[PDB]
Amino acid sequence: GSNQNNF
Ligand SMILES: [Zn+2]
CA 3 and chain centroid, separation: 3
Between CA 4 and CA 7 the distance in angstroms is 9
What single letter denotes the amino acid at residue 7?
F
Q: How far is the CA of 1 from the centre of ligand 1 (A)?
A: 3
How much distance in Å is there from the Cα of 2 to the middle of ligand 1?
A: 5
**3-state secondary structure labels for all residues of 1-7:** CCCCCCC
This structure's resolution (Å) is 1.1
3/5 Cα distance (integer angstroms): 7
3 alpha carbon – ligand 1 mean position (Å): 7
In the chain, the amino acid numbered 2 is S
User: CA-to-CA distance for 2 and 5, rounded, in angstroms?
Assistant: 10
CA of 4 to the centre of ligand 1 (A): 11
